[PDB]
Write a protein that binds this ligand. Structure first.
Ligand SMILES: C[C@@H](O)CN1CCN(CC(=O)O)CCN(CC(=O)O)CCN(CC(=O)O)CC1
Ligand SMILES: C[C@@H](O)CN1CCN(CC(=O)O)CCN(CC(=O)O)CCN(CC(=O)O)CC1
Ligand SMILES: [Cl-]
Ligand SMILES: [Cl-]
Ligand SMILES: [Cl-]
Ligand SMILES: [Gd]
Ligand code: NA
Length: 128
């Protein structure tokens, strides 16, 4: 699924993501745009052999199981494929654990380089 901007904001906000660990709703929509292009099916291979999955490109090294990342952890206790769903529940619960773990939204390289220190409220401007 390719989400529109307001549509993803109202989904994220209904799944509790808004001001989660003090990160405003504009920070999450910002990250999703630059991680996946709002596209739930997005995948990218990393050079160590793991893969990033879904709208927030969640890494198979620590967080989910795809059966091809040897001696890796599955801390969200899900298959990688679950994070490719049009229903963003799996991805959201999975991003709550990651952003809680000590490093915040710096886990998202696209968030750090393109949204941190900018006008993030611009990403929800106009939405009801
Ligand atoms: C709502 C309009 O913006 C729709 N839009 C009209 C064309 N725009 C003109 C403009 O953005 O004023 C120029 C191109 N546009 C640049 C950008 O938006 O950054 C990228 C494509 N956009 C993506 C999007 O906007 O979500 C869809 C088409
Ligand atoms: C031509 C305009 O599209 C210029 N545009 C600024 C104004 N946009 C317009 C809008 O989308 O209504 C609103 C703010 N915007 C939210 C979003 O667009 O998704 C984030 C910043 N954008 C990033 C991008 O375009 O990728 C910078 C370029
Ligand atoms: Cl915001
Ligand atoms: Cl594996
Ligand atoms: Cl923080
Ligand atoms: Gd824009
Ligand atoms: Na894994």
């Amino acid at each position: 699924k390719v989400f529109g901007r307001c549509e993803l904001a109202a989904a994220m906000k209904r799944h509790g993501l808004d001001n989660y660990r003090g990160y405003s709703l504009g920070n999450w929509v910002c990250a999703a745009k630059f991680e996946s292009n709002f596209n739930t099916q997005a995948t990218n291979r990393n050079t160590d052999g793991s893969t990033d999955y879904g709208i927030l490109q969640i890494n198979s090294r620590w967080w989910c199981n795809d059966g091809r990342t040897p001696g890796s952890r599955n801390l969200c206790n899900i298959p990688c494929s679950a994070l490719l769903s049009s229903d963003i529940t799996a991805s959201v619960n999975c991003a709550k654990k990651i952003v809680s773990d000590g490093n915040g939204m710096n886990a998202w390289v696209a968030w750090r380089n393109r949204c941190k220190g900018t006008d993030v409220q611009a990403w929800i401007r106009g939405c009801r």
